[PDB]
């Protein structure tokens, strides 16, 4: 099991995006994970449409929230998802485009053992993983750089993606991709302490991990 993993260095992670004024974190987290597994399996990194999920996943709640697993289920049932180029992000729920295309598809999704950072590390070593984090706190929102150590709660009020992990001067960390643009955190990313005392993980990051599968 690698001691260091960073999917960004393997060309499997897209440029940072911005969800803006829409409660679509669930869609951004799910899409990022899908974009990555597609690259890992097919060799091509394609930017996919978060907007399609906001408009077409009727099991989710548009800009009022949703869940990454709902998103994976939609992509599977729909037979795929369109590109960002053909179905651009508008940050508001609109009509689900009737003639959208199914460019990238997935075969299913796996739910990682809950509240177990070791199990989560194993999953991240294979591909980026979608997770929830408590991100309403001042410490988290004003994060600029370095390894974030809290404080924060465990509410599942935000969805992000873990794109790597490692250790720096004795401190274990997770590399987390946020969807608040490049002007937030460290060029859009946040390094969060890993292997903390609480089984739920820092800010509850280990509570509900899942990732898409593609044979």
């Amino acid at each position: 099991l690698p001691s260091f993993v960073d999917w960004r260095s393997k060309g499997a992670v897209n440029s940072i995006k911005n969800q803006k004024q829409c409660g679509s974190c669930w869609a951004f987290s799910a899409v990022a994970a899908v974009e990555s597994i597609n690259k890992i399996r097919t060799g091509q990194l394609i930017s996919l449409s978060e907007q399609e999920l906001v408009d077409c996943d009727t099991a989710s709640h548009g800009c009022n929230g949703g869940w990454m697993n709902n998103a994976f289920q939609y992509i599977i049932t729909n037979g795929g998802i369109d590109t960002q180029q053909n179905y651009p992000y508008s940050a508001v729920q609109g009509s689900c485009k009737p003639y959208r295309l199914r460019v990238v598809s997935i075969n299913g999704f796996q739910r990682v053992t809950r509240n177990n950072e070791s199990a989560l590390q194993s999953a991240v070593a294979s591909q980026p993983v979608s997770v929830t984090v408590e991100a309403a706190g001042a410490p988290f929102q004003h994060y600029s750089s370095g390894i974030f150590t809290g404080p924060c709660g465990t509410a599942q009020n935000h969805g992000v993606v873990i794109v790597g992990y490692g250790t720096q001067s004795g401190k274990n960390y997770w590399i987390v991709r946020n969807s608040w643009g490049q002007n937030w955190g460290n060029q859009g990313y946040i390094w969060m302490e890993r292997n903390v005392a609480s089984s739920a993980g820092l800010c509850g990051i280990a509570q509900l991990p899942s990732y898409p599968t593609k044979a």
Side-chain angles (χ1 to χ4, degrees):
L1 194 60
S3 61
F4 175 70
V5 174
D6 188 347
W7 286 105
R8 298 176 303 168
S9 70
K10 293 288 177 273
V13 182
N14 201 356
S15 294
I16 283 290
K17 296 183 184 180
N18 193 170
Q19 70 185 77
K20 302 188 182 190
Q21 301 302 297
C22 169
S24 53
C25 65
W26 56 280
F28 280 78
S29 173
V31 169
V34 172
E35 295 175 336
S36 292
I37 193 60
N38 182 243
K39 164 62 180 182
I40 292 170
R41 292 281 179 274
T42 76
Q44 207 84 65
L45 179 64
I46 305 175
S47 187
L48 302 175
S49 176
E50 287 81 16
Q51 192 62 51
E52 185 175 332
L53 293 178
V54 171
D55 298 339
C56 311
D57 179 7
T58 56
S60 285
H61 316 154
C63 288
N64 285 353
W67 295 99
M68 291 77 83
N69 286 177
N70 287 1
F72 297 144
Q73 298 190 314
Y74 164 82
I75 297 174
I76 293 172
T77 300
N78 188 57
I81 186 172
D82 214 337
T83 65
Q84 171 176 49
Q85 176 159 302
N86 199 51
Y87 204 152
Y89 189 60
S90 294
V92 62
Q93 184 176 57
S95 177
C96 174
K97 295 184 181 300
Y99 307 106
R100 59 189 185 292
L101 304 173
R102 293 149 181 67
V103 183
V104 171
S105 66
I106 58 174
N107 300 132
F109 71 94
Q110 299 279 184
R111 289 195 172 85
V112 177
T113 302
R114 286 72 178 76
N115 302 316
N116 190 319
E117 292 194 76
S118 292
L120 182 53
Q121 178 186 8
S122 181
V124 175
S126 289
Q127 69 190 86
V129 179
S130 292
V131 295
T132 68
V133 290
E134 195 286 292
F140 187 95
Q141 304 215 341
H142 292 161
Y143 167 80
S144 291
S145 67
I147 297 174
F148 179 70
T149 62
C152 48
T154 57
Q156 307 179 343
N157 57 37
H158 189 41
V160 295
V161 177
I162 299 179
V163 299
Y165 66 73
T167 301
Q168 174 175 284
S169 297
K171 195 169 284 287
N172 293 164
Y173 63 76
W174 292 114
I175 306 181
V176 179
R177 175 184 173 80
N178 205 348
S179 50
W180 295 346
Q182 293 180 41
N183 288 144
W184 179 85
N186 195 156
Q187 300 194 70
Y189 295 86
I190 176 170
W191 276 250
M192 296 177 68
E193 178 161 36
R194 175 169 63 92
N195 290 321
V196 294
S198 174
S199 264
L202 188 62
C203 310
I205 195 170
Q207 295 180 299
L208 196 80
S210 66
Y211 58 84
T213 59
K214 187 173 181 56

